[PDB]
Ligand binder design. Structure first.
Ligand SMILES: [Zn+2]
Lengths: 124, 101, 49, 92, 68, 181, 74, 75, 119, 49, 184
RNA sequence: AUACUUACCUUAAGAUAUCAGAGGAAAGUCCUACUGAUCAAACAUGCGCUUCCAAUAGUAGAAGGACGUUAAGCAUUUAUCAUUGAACUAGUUCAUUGAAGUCAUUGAUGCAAACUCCUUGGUCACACACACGGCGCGGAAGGCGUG
RNA sequence: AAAAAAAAAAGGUAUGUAUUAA
């Protein structure tokens, strides 16, 4: 499927589509953007998947097909208290090289902003 | 006296006192004297073990752990025992810890 | 406290022109005014007699 | 942290809530603090068992909040800029 | 006008029962020492829920109330 | 309290007795109602239930005398919605739509507008619009109705099939504003 | 405005008896005379009785932890 | 650290849900940083409005930990 | 003293992280945060079977286990195998570390000595 | 003046705010009268010379 | 700490709920931020998808079947032309954004409950909110009580007849040339 | 952008890899673009390292979706409580009074299929080549190693 | 034999008023 870097922390992984497990047995799958000290994180396009009480008997030990009722909720902010564990689903729309490119161009543009602001403030 | 007034070393002397003289001195005297301790968790089963280390939060490192857990369904009971060589225990689960004679 | 009155059912001579409980078409009026209310319609009845 | 700052950026916009009790409060966000406890205006409430009601004003404790749904257009909001250039802070 | 901390300082090395919040279990024993979080140490304790227990350490979160 | 202070007032006795003397005027009904509302003005859940029972029975007894009033079914629905029970709002929308034999443009538009907020389960929500369509859909001014319905597809639906499906039907209807679509 | 712990201090000095509800799991409610309190809202109750939820047994002078406190009611 | 902002709520009759099941209604008096809320003329709401409802006391204080949602029924 | 600083020297070891759910995770261990957030690499995480003539297992842990996406359809018992699970710290109950490593070398904290050597 | 300042300001401080506003307006009128008197005195001084 | 407001790019020192609340509500910060999301929102419509092309080797069959089909002519406007037509199309989209046909409100203007519903300030659901939505109005009506007793006869030289239905500017030559009857 | 008026407010602390040895200002501290070991980051760079990267010699197929249709699909189970009066067996029906009452019953639960539509990929080069299981150019994602 | 004084505003955000062109 997908191989995550053998040493990769929550800061190394951004924009990866994640799979988030809460205490209540439901899952939030989507792109991570930010997170925090106490690990409450922000997902971009996320869908909460749930195993109904009626399908649950199908998971108890004996090819299984579970009907997982899920609903779509975009740009949420989770709470660190509820989060249990996190897994990686996919890798970002952009490669590593391309993200280096956009990072460098973004930084250069950011410096250009500071110069254009400084010299717009100084003379007038 | 509140803790935010004290300096960096006064907290170290405070923790040294609390470990040496205080409730957790029951565990400390148990670590030095090689006396096995009984620990009840909130998960409702009990480990008979020997404490190699402990800490402020009560989380502690153990050696020769023996876990004892029973379960019942409709008043049908079974006792299960699980042996472990070395273990690390997070301190929030524990409730009572006694020092065996 | 309040009585519920149906001037249609009253002028039509039917029985149930008033009730304590709220029913679909009745108008709430003050109980003490109920007697007064009857006065206001009597001439209409007097025209039919 | 950024997650709370995004909640402060969502003031005056329709948001959704999930309390850990199971209910759902969807409505317009008036106030929010750094303790994540928010107060909402003209909100529709869904009880854990589905019964839906309506209340004009509500205040919820942040510890009981589970997830908050925020208008999608805040995704590209400047909080998420990785490389950003700030000026020098004023001297006081 | 006694407050909790001087109340524990006055209950040292006296016989005190402590009710935990779970099974309505109370440990009856001579208090030894307390922490700033009101961790408890006990000698010659007995568990009531019938047994006899030599020495006890009780963590602060699980106790319901402390009585003499 | 406020209730008893409203009863002992002379204006309630006079306005009321006028209504009960002259039922079909609708001028005395609307004064009796506008007055008993304004007495209650903090109409939120705090106000005592006797007064809410009176004002509610006043609406429901007025709408029976005049089965066609659209803005009053709407207004009484909104009173029930601000008061915190949406089930009574639904029911009395159903009542107004039933008084018109399910065809009135304002009660369907102002109804579904209410229905967008208080009803999840996208399927049922759209069944409301399909029920409204086979009734009031061909109304000459119904375009703004469709503007709601198209607005609800593009927000709900990821496929975009249904938007072409519906907008293709709107093309063939001689509405007042066809050109917008 | 009347801060809540100020109100509790008005329960200490006014010597009014109080009923206090615990968490919904335990199933008992305590009542007695609140004597003094700490910053953590853990209170000492003199002449306290535990009522299951009126045959409850009398407790004593008892320190009750603030973690289990739900209501303090006169 | 920061005091919760109830400032518009105080003196207004307010309903708030204690834990999962319970719902208490009373006139808010004061509050603190833990959202401990003291109110007067408390009443415990139940299924039957006049019947199962029973008043608590002249002054009641609530631990902020058991507070879930707080709605004011008032202006 | 913070005993979590011990776990940070256990890096690159086979370990079981036994959580509050009863869920057990066997895996190779990577950097442990100061809050005891434990990040693993190649993990097989499962639930034990209480036998007791069919005692229903944790209902939340089965759902949380199927929802990792790592449970394969043809597994007869209840397990899942996946790469890179990151575990919040407060979820951990017990940690069973291997028998081979010696504690006397790892249980020495450099800050504890540093405080005594300096005084 | 009440409807304009009533929206943003709390209702409990609306009364004292209103009284302070009326007092300020009165003080403004007084200052205007004093300026008028000074103007009259200046006119008289210009007429005497 | 210090609160950096990245919309305005201006720092504010020692963040406090009062000063931060005042800045966020501030008029300048308001204009700056609103314009910011106006740009960030116009971009997603402005940005071209530019999806990647995958070209496969055309088979011998469809090259022969497509060779007999004649080549179609393509039209390409001049730069000066396409700039103007893009301007026009964009300004037409902006027009279709703001249309929102209200004619129902124009129909019921004289209804007995018109003041309780369509005025939207005096309503129940939305009524109380509009008051708090009123701006601070720093410096420098249609009441609900109306009855049917006003305007008893809706027509006494009062009303304007209903506005004619609109028409597309492009196809405006499609209209039937002459009316069926003689209007004044 | 400048000037004036009014309002709201002001500094948690400390630190920037560790260990050991030699030197400078018996104990400790500080320091040495000093010496070794270990660790970490960035940058390069390699491995017959591992996995993956779609038909045109054809009208296809792989991954993932539909908050899509068939579809009132098929098979199941559900639609408030209290008080009074009448009849009634020894619980049932009707009428009245009060309380709350998410919508749905074309619903909800389970079961399965068919169809249709969306997003994505090197739709690369050489080759149509009787083998015992390689050593074409790149891209993506990793593991390991040296500098 | 002994002796005598001190050096200072800071600067952020918001609101209202005036100025910066045929
Ligand atoms: Zn700003």
């Amino acid at each position: 499927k997908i191989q995550v870097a053998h040493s990769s922390r929550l800061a190394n992984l951004i924009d990866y589509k994640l799979r988030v497990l809460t205490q209540d047995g439901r899952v939030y799958i989507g792109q991570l953007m930010a997170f925090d000290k106490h690990m409450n994180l922000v997902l971009n396009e996320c869908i909460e998947e749930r195993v109904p009480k009626t399908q649950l008997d199908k998971l108890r030990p004996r090819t299984l097909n579970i009907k997982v009722e899920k609903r779509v909720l975009g740009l949420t902010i989770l709470r660190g208290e509820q989060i249990l564990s996190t897994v990686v689903e996919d890798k970002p729309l952009l490669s590593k090289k391309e993200r280096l490119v956009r990072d460098k161009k973004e930084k250069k543009q950011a410096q250009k902003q500071t110069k254009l602001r400084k010299e717009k403030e100084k003379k007038p | 006296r509140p803790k935010h007034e004290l300096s960096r070393a006064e907290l170290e002397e405070l923790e040294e006192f609390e470990f040496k003289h205080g409730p957790m001195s029951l565990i400390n005297d148990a670590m030095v004297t090689r006396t096995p301790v009984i620990i009840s968790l909130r998960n409702n089963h009990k480990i008979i073990a020997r404490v190699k280390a402990f800490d402020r939060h009560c989380n502690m490192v153990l050696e020769n752990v023996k876990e004892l857990w029973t379960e019942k369904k409709g008043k049908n009971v079974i006792n299960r025992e699980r042996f472990i060589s070395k273990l690390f225990l997070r301190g929030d689960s524990v409730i009572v810890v006694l020092k065996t004679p | 406290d309040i009585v519920f009155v149906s001037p249609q059912l009253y002028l039509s001579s039917q029985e149930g022109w008033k009730s304590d409980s709220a029913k679909s078409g009745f108008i709430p009026i003050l109980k003490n005014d109920l007697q007064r209310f009857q006065d206001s319609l009597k001439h209409i009845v007097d025209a039919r007699n | 942290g950024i997650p709370v700052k995004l909640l402060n950026e969502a003031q005056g916009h329709i948001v959704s809530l999930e309390l850990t009790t199971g209910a759902t409060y969807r409505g317009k966000l008036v106030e929010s603090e750094d303790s994540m406890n928010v107060q909402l205006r003209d909100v529709i409430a869904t009880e854990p068992q589905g019964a839906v009601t309506h209340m004009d004003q509500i205040f919820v404790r942040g510890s009981q909040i589970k997830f908050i749904v925020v208008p999608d257009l805040l995704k590209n909001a400047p909080l998420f800029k990785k490389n950003s250039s700030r000026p020098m802070p004023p001297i006081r | 006008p006694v407050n909790p901390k001087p109340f524990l300082k006055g209950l040292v090395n006296h016989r005190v029962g402590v009710k935990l919040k779970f099974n309505s279990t109370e440990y009856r024993g001579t208090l030894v020492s307390t922490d700033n979080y009101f961790n408890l140490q006990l000698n010659e304790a007995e568990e009531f829920v019938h047994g006899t227990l030599g020495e006890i350490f009780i963590r602060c979160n699980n106790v319901l109330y402390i009585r003499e | 309290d406020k209730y008893t202070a409203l009863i002992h007032d002379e204006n309630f006795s006079t306005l009321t007795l006028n209504v009960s003397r002259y039922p079909k005027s609708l001028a005395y009904w609307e004064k009796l109602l506008n007055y008993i509302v304004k007495a209650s003005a903090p109409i939120c859940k705090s106000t005592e239930p006797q007064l809410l029972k009176l004002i509610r029975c006043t609406y429901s007894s007025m709408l029976n005398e005049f089965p066609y009033l659209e803005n009053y079914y709407i207004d009484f629905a909104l009173l029930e919605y601000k008061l915190g029970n949406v089930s009574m709002s639904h029911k009395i929308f159903q009542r107004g739509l039933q008084a018109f034999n399910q065809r009135s443009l304002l009660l369907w538009t102002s109804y579904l507008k209410f229905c967008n907020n208080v009803i999840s389960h996208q399927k049922q929500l759209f069944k409301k619009y399909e029920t409204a369509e086979e009734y009031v859909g061909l109304h000459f001014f119904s375009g703004e109705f469709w503007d709601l319905y198209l607005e609800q597809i593009s927000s709900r639906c990821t496929s975009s099939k249904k938007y072409w499906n519906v907008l293709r039907k709107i093309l063939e209807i001689p509405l007042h504003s066809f050109s917008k679509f | 405005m009347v801060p809540p712990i100020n109100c509790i201090f008005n329960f200490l000095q006014q010597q009014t008896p109080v009923t206090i509800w615990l968490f919904e799991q335990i199933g008992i409610r305590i009542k007695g005379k609140i004597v003094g309190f700490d910053e953590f809202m853990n209170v000492v109750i003199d002449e306290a009785v535990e009522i299951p939820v009126e045959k409850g047994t009398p407790l004593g002078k008892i320190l009750l932890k603030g973690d289990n406190i739900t209501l303090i009611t006169s | 650290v920061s005091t919760p902002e109830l400032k518009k709520y105080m003196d207004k009759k307010i309903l708030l849900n204690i834990n999962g099941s319970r719902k208490v209604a009373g006139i808010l008096r004061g509050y603190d940083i833990f959202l401990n809320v003291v109110l007067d003329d408390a009443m415990e709401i139940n299924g039957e409005d006049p019947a199962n409802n029973h008043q608590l006391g002249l002054q009641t204080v609530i631990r902020g930990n058991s507070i879930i949602s707080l709605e004011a029924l008032d202006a | 003293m913070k005993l979590v600083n011990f776990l940070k020297k256990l890096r690159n070891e086979q370990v079981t992280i036994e959580l509050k759910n009863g869920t057990t995770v066997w895996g190779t261990l990577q950097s442990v945060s100061p809050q005891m957030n434990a990040i693993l690499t190649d993990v097989k995480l499962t639930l034990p079977q209480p036998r007791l003539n069919k005692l229903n297992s944790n209902g939340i842990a089965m759902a949380s286990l199927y929802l990792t996406g790592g449970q394969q359809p043809t597994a007869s018992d209840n397990i899942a195998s996946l790469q890179y699970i990151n575990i919040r710290g407060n979820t951990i109950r017990q940690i069973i570390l291997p028998d081979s490593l010696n504690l006397d070398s790892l249980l020495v904290d450099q800050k504890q000595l540093n405080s005594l050597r300096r005084s | 003046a009440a409807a304009a300042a009533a929206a943003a300001a709390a209702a409990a401080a609306a009364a004292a705010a209103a009284a302070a506003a009326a007092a300020a307006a009165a003080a403004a009128a007084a200052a205007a009268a004093a300026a008028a008197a000074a103007a009259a005195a200046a006119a008289a001084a210009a007429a005497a010379a | 700490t210090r609160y950096y407001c990245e919309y305005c790019h201006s720092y504010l020192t020692h963040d406090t709920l009062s000063v931060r609340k005042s800045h966020l509500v501030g008029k300048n910060h308001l204009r700056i931020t609103a314009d910011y999301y106006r740009n960030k929102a116009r971009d997603i419509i402005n940005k071209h998808n530019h999806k990647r092309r995958h070209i496969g080797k055309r088979g011998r069959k469809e090259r022969e079947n497509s060779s007999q089909n004649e080549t179609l002519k393509v039209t390409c406007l001049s730069n000066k032309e396409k700039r103007h037509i893009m301007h026009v199309k964009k300004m037409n989209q902006k027009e279709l954004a703001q249309t929102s046909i209200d004619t129902l409100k124009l129909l019921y203007d004289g209804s007995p409950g018109y003041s309780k519903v369509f005025v939207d300030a005096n309503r129940f659901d939305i009524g109380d909110l509009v008051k708090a939505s009123k701006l601070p109005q720093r410096a420098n009506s249609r009441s609900r009580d109306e009855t049917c007793e006003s305007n008893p006869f809706p027509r006494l030289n009062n009303p304007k007849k209903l506005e004619p239905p609109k028409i597309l500017s492009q196809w405006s030559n499609t209209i039937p040339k002459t009316s069926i009857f003689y209007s004044v």
